[PDB]
Amino acid sequence: GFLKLIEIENFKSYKGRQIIGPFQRFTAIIGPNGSGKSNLMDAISFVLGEKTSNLRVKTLRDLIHGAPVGKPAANRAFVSMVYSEEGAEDRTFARVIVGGSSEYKINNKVVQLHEYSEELEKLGILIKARNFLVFQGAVESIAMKNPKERTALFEEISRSGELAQEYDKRKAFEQIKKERFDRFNACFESVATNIDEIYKALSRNSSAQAFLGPENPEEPYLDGINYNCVAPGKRFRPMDNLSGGEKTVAALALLFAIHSYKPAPFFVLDQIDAALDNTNIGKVANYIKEQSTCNFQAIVISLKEEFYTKAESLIGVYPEQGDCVISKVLTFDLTKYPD
Amino acid sequence: AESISLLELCRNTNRKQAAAKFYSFLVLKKQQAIELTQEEPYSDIIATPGPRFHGSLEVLF
Numbered sequence: 330g331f332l333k334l335i336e337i338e339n340f341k342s343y344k345g346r347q348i349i350g351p352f353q354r355f356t357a358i359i360g361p362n363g364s365g366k367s368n369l370m371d372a373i374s375f376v377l378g379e380k381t382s383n384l385r386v387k388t389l390r391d392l393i394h395g396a397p398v399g400k401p402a403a404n405r406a407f408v409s410m411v412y413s414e415e416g417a418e419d420r421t422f423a424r425v426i427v428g429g430s431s432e433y434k435i436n437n438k439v440v441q442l443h444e445y446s447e448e449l450e451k452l453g454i455l456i457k458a459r460n461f462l463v464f465q466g467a468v469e470s471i472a473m474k475n476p477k478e479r480t481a482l483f484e485e486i487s488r489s490g491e492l493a494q495e496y497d498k499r500k501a502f503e504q505i506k507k508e509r510f511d512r513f514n515a516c517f518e519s520v521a522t523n524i525d526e527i528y529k530a531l532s533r534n535s536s537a538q539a540f541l542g543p544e545n546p547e548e549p550y551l552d553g554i555n556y557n558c559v560a561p562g563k564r565f566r567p568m569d570n571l572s573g574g575e576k577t578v579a580a581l582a583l584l585f586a587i588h589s590y591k592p593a594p595f596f597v598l599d600q601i602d603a604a605l606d607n608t609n610i611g612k613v614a615n616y617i618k619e620q621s622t623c624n625f626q627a628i629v630i631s632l633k634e635e636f637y638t639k640a641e642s643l644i645g646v647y648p649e650q651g652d653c654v655i656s657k658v659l660t661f662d663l664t665k666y667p668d
Numbered sequence: 669a670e671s672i673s674l675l676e677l678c679r680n681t682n683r684k685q686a687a688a689k690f691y692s693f694l695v696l697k698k699q700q701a702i703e704l705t706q707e708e709p710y711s712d713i714i715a716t717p718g719p720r721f722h723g724s725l726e727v728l729f
């Protein structure tokens with residue numbers, strides 16, 4: 330499946346009814362500062378159920394265009410997402426702001442948040458986990474974690490960390506010791522299987538190598554997760570001893586390998602290149618381009634031309650002045666031109 | 669009045685150059701040097717004069 334388009338109405342700086350996209354398999358959202366790039370990000374989070382307090386407001390009605398200045402433009406606003414699966418008709422998921430609470434709709438049938446979340450999960454979209462989203466700083470956050478913090482992250486995403494309290498409660502407790510194990514490995518081993526190929530792809534170099542290993546092969550949750558890299562032209566080191574740019578690539582490989590386990594059909598990357606450099610930014614970009622063809626749809630919000638020019642599609646955001654600022658979008662196809 | 673097509677501007681350019689022309693329409697629209705029209709998604713983007721610049725749009729590009 331694939332995110333075909335976003336329809337917005339009076340959400341934040343998107344005054345009126347606007348059509349965003351259609352998206353291609355690799356689309357980049359660009360524009361000069363303060364036009365509405367990050368509000369469009371909030372629009373996407375919003376239709377996928379993000380809690381109001383993560384949308385940079387105190388209450389739901391402050392999302393309506395014009396509310397921050399006391400001049401709301403309507404009593405009602407919404408974001409809708411058109412989701413398409415080859416073989417099936419299109420499905421529309423919408424969140425409407427109606428009298429200060431959220432109305433959820435699938436194909437224009439009001440549903441409760443439980444049904445909305447559940448139908449999204451069946452498509453591989455996990456609104457509580459946020460599998461579809463790479464936030465800014467996500468790299469630097471990854472690049473800073475030690476083996477034990479990597480285990481913790483794996484505890485959360487695998488949800489073995491849930492069986493954690495019930496775990497040491499039982500000290501034949503292997504009934505849960507086996508299943509905290511199996512729940513940690515259902516996730517970790519898939520990441521471990523994939524990280525080497527991802528790290529070669531990012532490095533764009535078949536001699537790069539990466540390994541992820543439990544310190545305690547019996548109870549991996551009990552111990553750290555070792556991460557070793559053969560950086561191009563170097564010898565195997567623990568990732569934590571890597572250096573500036575080399576550490577960044579390994580962080581990136583670990584990040585994408587986390588997301589290759591139960592991946593979302595589409596992947597929203599929010600300025601994942603603010604911490605890049607010309608010496609690698611295009612191999613990240615070429616990796617995304619390569620993956621977008623079959624593995625996942627990519628939606629990148631980006632400021633670096635060497636990144637967003639590898640996109641098929643450009644959604645450019647621009648401002649007008651009004652109540653606050655008015656955002657509008659242009660669509661531009663890059664596949665017409667060579668290079 | 670004077671009008672300019674982004675797709676004409678982009679004839680015989682590569683992806684980096686075409687994207688830079690596209691990005692310039694966003695910058696020049698923010699600075700109010702032009703107006704922008706796009707009839708439908710992925711159709712041509714037309715530039716026309718704006719309130720805050722008055723020289724020739726042709727020469728501007």
Ligand SMILES: Nc1ncnc2c1ncn2[C@@H]1O[C@H](COP(=O)(O)OP(=O)(O)O)[C@@H](O)[C@H]1O
Nearest residue numbers: 341342362363364365366367368393394395653
């Ligand atoms: N409810 C709203 N109504 C009108 N404008 C808004 C609203 N919410 C945010 N904005 C405006 O959106 C503008 C910038 O949009 P933003 O996406 O955050 O910037 P950028 O393009 O740099 O990412 C801000 O001037 C902000 O005041």
